[PDB]
Structure formats: structure tokens, C-alpha cells
């Protein structure tokens, strides 16, 4: 209510909306000047444009939310902690603890005594404060085994129910995850896929939507461009409104306004291609100790689809979205052809 806009802003908003360049402009305009791996932020906009609402006031069934989770993982040299401390300075409901930042109990049920009432109290959590928001997470593979069977509850039921000697609780909490895991080494080992490298099960590894692989640019050539441009960045100490026109705050309402007045819907579009090619897509019986395609993908796919149809504000589903969705998937779904 305290952010309802005037109709004059709709001019500039839909003016940005009217061009296919918008898919790339905001992906370019998140970072201050970081002009590498822009192939990924174009998917992060699908969480910034925080998903779809196929509401469940209909029958009470199945609670299939537009559940979006996507993660990054690679070396510590890439600016994951830095980028995400900046993303803390982007997202409204910004939380930022991290792997071995606080335990499961360190994330839920901060139950303890208070001298204000001077009495013992059933008390707070951390995740549930960020309902529908985000929590940037770092250095994931340091957390205790008690934790990380908590997130199974949320990621796969999107709920929480708590019971201690005091209260038994059935609260509400749901949100989208971001996190920036790291391995037990400095570098991901080649000839050792992520299927075993990082510390997780045989098929719960791939159980996230898609982990957009990241690694240091293994190339000396790129070093000069940033070592020059991003030091001149400091050396001049101000910015310039080049072709990718940075709007000071008018960009931010295209994010803001576009959660509320939209309801993506499917006519005939984003079903039929894999419904056709399912034979060769589902010959996945072959493999020695592998992981591959399963009949859950299209849930996540319809999610990503109606997400990218939200951008451009297509109230009916987008058909182009399917193409870059397939691109998104097969960008990293045979990183283990081996």
C-alpha cells in the first residue's frame, strides 16, 4: 500500500517493456560494471522477478507453488560473497548468514530467556522472517548434519511445524533459495564431476532446479580488461549513462510493480515439444551410477516458463520463453557426458 505508483510511471515502465532488449538490459544492469558471465544473471532475474503465483484457493490440493531455487557453485575467487553482499543491497527482504553461519537451531527457534518479561518464552526463527523473500548464503559445505535435513522440509513440502516441551507450532514460511557453495578444495577437480565432489547424496545433488556452474576464468587474456576498466572505475569515481541506460530508481518499479497485477496463464504453448520428444528424452535407463532426466523437470520448466513470460508482462504465456528455458537447462545438464 505504501508503494502504489502513479500512472505516469507506467509510461517509462511499459516503454522498457516494449523492446526484446529488456531480457538483456536488466541482466546487464544489475552489476555496477562486472561484464563477465552475464549469461547467468538473465536467469537470476527469474528470481528477482520472484516467480509466479498459481494460487491454491481452488480445491486445497497439492500446494504446487511456483517453487524456484537456483544456486551457484565454483571457486572462492569468483565474487560470490561480494556479489551477494551487493545483492543484499538489492533485495528488499535481504538476509545473509551462510554455511557455518548459524545452525538449524541457529536458523530456527532462538528460544531463550529474556529479562524484559523476566520469564522463559517460546521464540523466534530466521528463515520465517523472509517469507517470499531471499537469503543469500555462502560457503555451504560446512554445516552440521542436523541442519540440511531441515531445508528438506521446506524445499520439498514448503511448510514448517515445530514441537518442543513448550509450544507445538504450525507456522507459515516459504521463500526462494540462493546459495554459493564451495568444495573442500580450492578448485573443482576435473575427472571428478559434481556428482560426487561436493558433499551431498547421489540424486539430491541434481534435485535443485539447475546449478549454474561457475569457476575462475582459466584464461590470462581476460585479466587485463578488468584490471584496466575496473581500476579506472575507481580512478574516475563516478558513472556514465551509456547505451544500457541505468535508470536511477525508475528501473526498480518494473521489479516492484510486476509482482501484483499479473497472472501468467497457458493456452497451448509450453507443453508440446517435450510431450513430442519424450522417447529420446526419457531413454535415461542407461548409465552406471549416473544421474539424469526424471519426470519432475516439467514442473520446474513450467515455473521458469511462466516466469520469463512475466517479464515482457505477457499475461498469457510466452512461447519464446521455452527456447531460452531449454537453453538454460542444456547449458549445464550434460556437464558429465564423460
Amino acid at each position: 500500500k505504501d508503494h502504489i505508483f502513479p500512472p505516469e510511471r507506467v509510461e517509462l515502465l511499459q516503454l522498457l517493456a516494449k523492446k526484446p532488449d529488456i531480457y538483456d538490459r536488466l541482466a546487464r544492469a544489475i552489476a555496477p560494471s562486472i561484464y563477465e558471465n552475464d549469461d547467468i544473471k538473465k536467469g537470476i532475474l527469474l528470481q528477482l522477478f520472484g516467480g509466479t503465483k498459481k494460487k491454491h484457493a481452488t480445491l486445497g490440493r497439492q500446494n504446487f507453488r511456483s517453487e524456484i531455487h537456483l544456486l551457484l557453485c565454483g571457486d572462492p575467487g569468483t565474487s560470490k560473497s561480494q556479489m551477494l553482499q551487493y545483492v543484499f543491497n538489492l533485495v528488499p527482504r535481504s538476509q545473509y548468514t551462510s554455511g557455518r553461519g548459524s545452525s538449524a537451531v541457529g536458523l530456527t527457534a532462538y528460544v531463550t530467556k529474556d529479562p524484559e518479561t523476566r520469564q522463559l518464552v517460546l521464540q523466534t526463527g530466521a528463515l520465517v522472517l523472509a517469507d517470499n523473500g531471499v537469503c543469500c548464503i555462502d560457503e555451504f559445505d560446512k554445516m552440521n548434519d542436523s541442519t540440511r535435513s531441515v531445508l528438506h522440509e521446506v524445499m520439498e513440502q514448503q511448510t514448517l511445524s515445530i514441537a518442543k516441551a513448550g509450544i507445538i507450532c504450525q507456522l507459515n514460511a516459504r521463500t526462494s533459495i540462493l546459495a554459493a557453495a564451495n568444495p573442500a578444495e580450492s578448485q573443482w577437480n576435473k575427472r571428478k564431476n559434481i556428482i560426487d565432489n561436493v558433499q551431498l547424496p547421489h540424486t539430491l545433488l541434481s534435485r535443485f532446479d539447475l546449478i549454474f556452474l561457475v569457476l575462475d576464468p582459466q584464461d590470462e587474456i581476460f585479466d587485463k580488461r578488468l584490471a584496466s576498466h575496473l581500476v579506472s572505475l575507481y580512478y574516475v569515481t563516478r558513472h556514465e549513462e551509456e547505451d544500457t541506460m541505468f535508470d536511477m530508481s525508475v528501473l526498480r518499479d518494473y521489479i516492484a510493480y510486476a509482482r501484483e497485477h499479473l497472472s501468467p496463464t497457458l493456452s497451448d504453448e509450453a507443453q508440446q515439444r517435450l510431450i513430442q520428444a519424450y522417447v529420446d528424452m526419457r531413454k535415461v535407463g542407461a548409465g552406471r551410477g549416473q544421474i539424469s532426466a526424471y519426470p519432475r523437470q516439467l514442473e520446474s520448466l513450467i515455473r521458469l516458463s511462466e516466469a520469463h513470460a512475466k517479464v515482457r508482462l505477457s499475461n498469457q504465456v510466452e512461447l519464446l520463453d521455452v527456447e531460452e528455458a531449454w537453453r538454460l537447462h542444456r547449458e549445464a545438464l550434460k556437464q558429465s557426458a564423460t
Binding site: 514441537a163 516441551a165 513448550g166 507445538i168
Partner: protein, 267 residues
Amino acid sequence: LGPRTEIANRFQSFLRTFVDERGAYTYRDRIRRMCEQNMSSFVVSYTDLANKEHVLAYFLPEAPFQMLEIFDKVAKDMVLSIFPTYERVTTEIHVRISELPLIEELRTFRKLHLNQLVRTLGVVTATTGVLPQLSVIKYDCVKCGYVLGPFNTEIKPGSCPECQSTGPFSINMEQTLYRNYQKITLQESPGRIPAGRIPRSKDVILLADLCDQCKPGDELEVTGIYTNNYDGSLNTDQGFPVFATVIIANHVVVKDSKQVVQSLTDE
């Protein structure tokens, strides 16, 4: 009085008029059964009272203290009259009840249950040890050196051997009667809970004939009567007066029964 005498007299015309078990009714002989063994813990059946005279359910709650006292006078004036040699060992009596048509679970009793007949059970936890008490008011005058005489409330009359004088006083550590004492903490069983929460509890007092009978971690059955601590410092208050609750013990039944136990039919 006319009617207010009839209570003991109906007990007298009860314990040799009401009969079961094909003659030679128990309480004709249960009382001497107990005076033999020097126990002084005679026990009453309520169902037998309903079989003989049902009057004794409405006459009771208006002050069951007085009901129990008018009970014990009868056991005295029976036993110590018919066994006059007896007046050596204890010289005091009271009675017990073990038949009540109701088991009131915990977390069920309120101000409506005040100062009247009860049944409840649960489990013991930590409580005190074994301590004696006082029983009688007797002082020692300190001006004139006499004793004021024999007399939760103080008395202190002006009448005394010291020319009904000597407001001051002092006290000896003897020639006054004493009384054993013990406390308990009654908690409810972890079976019949509201399925996973904290439990509730009350404190209970038991008295001298009933001690070194209970134990930590035990099963329980008690008649009890609901107390009222008369003042936990009434004054400028909290959001509540600081008031409290106990039940006073009349008669226990244990549920384990780890002794040679059952009373005996005639045949």
C-alpha cells in the same frame, strides 16, 4: 443437641445393625482387629454407608472437618471404654475412607471444589523428609514464673495462675504434644497427559499416621480434601493475588500393593 447428636449415635447403631457376608459384620470386629495390632488407622466403607443410611452425603460437605471429628469421638468412646487398658500406647484415633464413586483427573479442579470431598491420583516426585510439629498451646509465664495453662490461630487469654496477669511469656521444649509431618508433590501420570505438553501439579499434606508410606516415583490413590491457604500476603497485588493451593490427606490407597494385602471374607 437433638439432631446434631444423632451422627455418632447412628454410627453406634450402624456398627452393630448393618450386616453383610452372612452375619458377624466386619466393623463389629474390624475395630478390635485393629486395636490388637496397635495400628490406629480404622477405615470406613462409603458404599456400606449408602447401603445402610444414605443421609451421609449431603450432611458432609458443609464442613467435613467436623464430620471426621464427630467420627473419631465415636471410635474413642467405643475402644477406650471397651478396652480401658488400651489408654497407654497412642490414645488417639482417626478413620479412613476408601470408596468414592469418582476419579477426578488432574487439571480438572477449580474454586468450586473448595473444602469438600475429593478423589484424585497421580505420581510422586521430590518432596521433604520427615519432621515433627506442635499439637497444643502451652507457654511459661516469665514475670511470675507460672505456666499460662493449656489452650492456624493464636489464643493468649489474660486468665492464668499469675493473678490473670503477665502478658509476657516464654516457652519450654517439653510437656507439649507433638505431631509428625511430611510433604508431597503430586504430578500427573505421563500417560494421561494432553499428549506432549508440560504437566500440572499440586502440593499435598499428609499427617502423622501417614508417613514413610509414600516414595519418589510411585503409583497413587488418595481421597484428599481441597485446602485454601488463607492469605499469601494480601496487599497491593500483582495482576493476581499471590494465593496458593494444597489438598489435605485423609486416606491413601497405593496401586502396587507390595505387601500381604487383602482383607478376609468370612468363608
